[PDB]
Point group: C2
Chain length 230, copies 2
């Protein structure tokens, strides 16, 4: 499996050309992220919402070269209309990958879920500058200084739903992974409301991660849904 | 370009393996057709509707080996929310390709549109047994007995909008072509209400076409939309 990254010949424009297994990055018509345009988004009257069943667990953390990833032990899940997906992990992007009207946010966060058949559901949370984020602060104390370590902290418990915004409105669309092999068939939900982190918090995250965001992909035939009515 | 059909080693389960250009038939996550489940469909408050601008022209007709196709001259178009697609053709499938709650209809009809950038939008109309369809009856008088000719009739005019149901409600989703190369990125609208054709009409169409319907594909990460609210 070839090396890929966010700059140069390895960068996002060349992903689809790096190896046969990566080709969807270039040939897919339902890719993520997308530019989110609220004016263009379609209101709904019965879009399924989701129920969160996350349990408190020791912090397992890794800088895998492409992102900072928190690995979740089996036992946490969501239910989208009674359909159950297991929380596998969450990780971070600086700057954000999704845009609002063509503008990036300073940071984006992805909570990755999978069901029994291999189906993926992702919850995306956007950050903007503002109040210090206490939940983020717990995490940042333990940023790994080593690449590709797994770094366990038994006594640190962070509930991932602490990162959820107060407003529960979200956008939903059918998309893909934003990293190779860019697999499609991903159920995306993106919270409308960004949460806040401090400027110095956002800066340290960016300094740590570098720029690890994929450029926005064409919406094509897809409809962007709102979870509330117009 | 390799030969494909609807039975045997050339059949739909194998399309994706007949040639590299056909691989999306096998690897796609947003394929058509789908089983349409009215219970699962999500009502909307501001999904774009469409305006129909079709003009009356001589009947150009061809059996291309896989279907019966009526070719439309440049000048007919629809506008989806002010965005314009040109009508290229319409053609027929027996039995239907889309299902409702797992049941096929006797026949399905596809109006294919393409815009300037190559984006495709298909309007699908379902047939059920019932009244003799007069518009269908004109068309059947001129079924080509020759493969791959174009068979023009200057004096026969059929307005394609005659095939539209009285009820204008529809289901919409993001999908694909239902034939190789199974290109994705197709904007699908399927009328909720079937129109009627006589048992003898449907029977003769089926006998003419053979079985030319692709099996239903997994909905995966897609939401099925209704053009009206709950
Ligand atoms: Zn991500
Ligand atoms: Zn068709």
């Amino acid at each position: 499996p070839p090396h890929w990254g966010y700059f140069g010949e390895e960068g996002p424009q060349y992903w689809g050309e790096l190896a046969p297994e990566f080709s969807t990055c270039k040939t897919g018509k339902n890719q993520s992220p997308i530019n989110l345009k609220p004016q263009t988004a379609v209101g709904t009257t019965s879009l399924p919402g989701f129920d969160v069943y996350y349990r408190e667990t020791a912090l397992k953390l890794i800088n895998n070269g492409h992102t900072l990833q928190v690995n979740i032990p089996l036992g946490s899940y969501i239910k989208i209309n009674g359909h159950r997906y297991e929380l596998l992990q969450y990780h971070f992007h600086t700057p954000s990958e999704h845009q609002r009207d063509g503008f990036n946010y300073p940071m984006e966060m992805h909570l990755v879920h999978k069901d029994g058949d291999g189906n993926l559901a992702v919850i995306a949370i956007l950050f903007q500058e503002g109040e210090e984020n206490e939940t983020l602060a717990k995490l940042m104390s333990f940023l790994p200084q080593t690449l590709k370590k797994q770094e366990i902290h038994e006594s640190v418990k962070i509930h991932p739903a602490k990162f959820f915004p107060a407003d529960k409105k979200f956008y939903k669309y059918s998309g893909s992974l934003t990293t190779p092999p860019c697999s499609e068939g991903v159920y995306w939900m993106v919270f409308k409301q960004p949460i806040q982190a401090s400027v110095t918090q956002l800066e340290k995250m960016h300094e740590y991660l570098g720029s690890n965001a994929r450029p926005v992909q064409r919406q094509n035939a897809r409809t962007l849904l709102k979870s509330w009515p117009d």
